[PDB]
Symmetry: C2
Subunit: 504 residues, 2 copies
Amino acid sequence: MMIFTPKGKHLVAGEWLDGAGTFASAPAHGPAHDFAVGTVELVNRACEAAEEAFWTYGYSSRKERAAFLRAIADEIEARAEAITEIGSQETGLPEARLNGERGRTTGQLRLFADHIEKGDYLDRRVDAAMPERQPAPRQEIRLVQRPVGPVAVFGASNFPLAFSTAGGDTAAALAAGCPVVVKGHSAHPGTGEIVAEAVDAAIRKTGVHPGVFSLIQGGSRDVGHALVQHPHIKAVGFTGSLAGGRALFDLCAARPEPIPFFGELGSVNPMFLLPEALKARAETLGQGWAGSLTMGAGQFCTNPGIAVVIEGADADRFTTAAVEALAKVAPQTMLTDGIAKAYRDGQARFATRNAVKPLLATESSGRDASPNLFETTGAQFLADHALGEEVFGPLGLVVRVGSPAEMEELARGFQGQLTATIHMDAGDLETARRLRPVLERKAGRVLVNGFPTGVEVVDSMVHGGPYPASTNFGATSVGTMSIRRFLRPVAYQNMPEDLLPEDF
Amino acid sequence: FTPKGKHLVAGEWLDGAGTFASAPAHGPAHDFAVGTVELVNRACEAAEEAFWTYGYSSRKERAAFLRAIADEIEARAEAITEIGSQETGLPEARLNGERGRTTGQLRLFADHIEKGDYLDRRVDAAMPERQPAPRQEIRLVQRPVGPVAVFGASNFPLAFSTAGGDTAAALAAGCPVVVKGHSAHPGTGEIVAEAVDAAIRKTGVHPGVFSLIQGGSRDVGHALVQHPHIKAVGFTGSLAGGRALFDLCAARPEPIPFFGELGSVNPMFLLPEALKARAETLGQGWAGSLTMGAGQFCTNPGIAVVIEGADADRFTTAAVEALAKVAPQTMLTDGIAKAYRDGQARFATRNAVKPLLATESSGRDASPNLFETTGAQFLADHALGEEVFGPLGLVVRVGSPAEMEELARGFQGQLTATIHMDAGDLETARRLRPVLERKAGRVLVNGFPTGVEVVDSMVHGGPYPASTNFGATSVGTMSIRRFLRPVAYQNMPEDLLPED
């Protein structure tokens, strides 16, 4: 009945390969499949090929790469039906999610294609010769961005298309002129396979070197390590956990020749609901929040885990409105059993703090999660660092504060976040103005009157934030500026026109 | 000019853990405060406090501050040259020229931030009409990262030091700076700090926007790069010291980027038609570039790669005869002069290398040297490819264009690589350029790498081990990016937007 049955092989520079035995997928529904296990040899093979591809692909024209990105997008769209089927099986995410995230993925490819055809990203600059200058002449100097080299991409589990195989990091690296070696996530190997098939088809059709793209399935921890330590890998894009991300970052920094590691890690994504907005719109705000908390079983990196409110009647209105909306939400299947378990473990760390009162507690079982809501005061939150812990899943925490001054205090105490949000009416402006300069420094994206769960794929996006939200040191992982992670500028001095690189 | 010998910590001139003595080439030694951890903490706390004003500065305000710094430096020209030439042993002409570089660089950043293009402002308009869900407006702008630590260079005591290119770029971005001042030119540090202090008092900027901590131990430097409030580091110096600080920055509970320029040999490839037509002037031009500033340039061209033959012999003879005329020149410190003598011996004691000019240096002075070797011997010994800081050249003779190109493939990352060519060398040049552009931040044709222009188009940096910049430049307007982070603002009322 299956539209797609997986090969279960690695794709290494145009060849489908077996591995050190096999591992079974763990789908939420549908049949398990066996996938090749990755090895350090397979990593070496992919990275050598990516190096060899770079001599041609690193030197290709923008028009040629735009063609190739458009070809990948067209191939992914030719596989819409198989992507939704295997994708929903593996992850437990509804079909409607897989279909929409496919559209995000292909549109993101095509936005990069348009972006490089414009050419502004090359940062081309020129300073003319001045033979007349005294006491010594100036030679002509030109600058242009160039691709860094092969890049490693560690796909995200929770966005198995748009942050995975041919997702934002792969797309930015290919657009720059970097071949990509993707460490496939164990949680969706069949979904990684159908997208690797699309990329493979695009490579055969366009004629680019097959070493431009590899996918290695199921690495043991030594396999992920070998990849970020490989001498030909020149940068890493990663989306995952703090512990996992920081360990790879430290490996990149410990290499004989270190390389930049661009990882998007954990955030609580706090929102601050100001007194006048809350007075006017508390119910709508509490329902808007319950919607954001529970989308995709809570499995968004931008999930607003914390709402900060000045104590009183309007807070109560908001909190009741949230509780009510949340009480209506049925269990949702999560991405893996380990994730469902971590969620329960998290729920238990809240249920057992005497510092926290539960507003909603549900039993979650198996691979499913039902929402939870807890409440605490600012002083108890400022008392216990663990209450600002990210819980991956649909758990929310209301922190009731005494005043704007205490709300600012909390805001100053947060570690770096992907996002921070202010809910406000025109009468909240003075408070919002005290908060904005603190939140600007804590997060890569500051939202007013919105929920941080939707991340627009636009030129203006900053998806990332101060460590420990990311190790991006300013870079974004989404939007066209993310292409900077994979470029290095080079200056060309006194160079004859016929020797200049094509990029000019 | 008679130095006070004090640290400048947020508008206050402070004592330290006793004094250390300057070691000038000529003139009086002076005593200077020793830096401490507590003084690092005080400067970093004040820089954080200053950030809430300075980091929220207008570009107009910061340009006026940069221009005021430049004006105050030019107001102290004679003092700067005096104490500068004394401490470093460099000629007065070099200190004069370098002061112009320093003021001109500040001015360039003032002009750059007034144009505003560096802020990368972008806007994606609202789409209320979009469904399923409408799109809210998103706007992006670059913001200063926070307080920045700057380690001044020993070898450019103005332009890569107290108010040099890293300080200029950080102040331009909106970042307060704490300077770990190099112990080889403390009075030159002090006088430029007294200029920055005067500009701060004239303009009304927060006094914690700038601090200078003199001397102090290896632990002072460590505490600066590990300070929780320091958000980025600019550094110019040795591979060993720079990698050590890089490693500390990555090991912090909250890591921060470390931008360190670390040294290179800056190889040149002299192609056969050029060597046939201009071997002598090429050997003469190399000799001048090798010996400039007692060889004390991070971009000093330490290696010439040539295909063997009569023309390579002409080039070698010409370079030796030109080097032989060059008088010893005083180096920046005794320790540098001694490390240079060590580098000469590194060559002079290897049987795989032939000495061509092997004069011994004494005391603080450096004698030019020249050695020769073959491609195979070079690749066989990593030591032969390591930087010598001072006026020593190595000629590396290969057998063919293929072997030259394989040698190019073998180099570690460099600040620069150079091709000397004539029109008939174009096809060989075309095979080399893709290789060298992956090895170096700046690829030069027909020039010497020693001069680094301060222009929009400069990339002064290179793949590790030349720098830890991962692409960033240390010099040129693009260097401002090291100290900026973009922030997106979604659905934000005009009234609440930051002023940029």
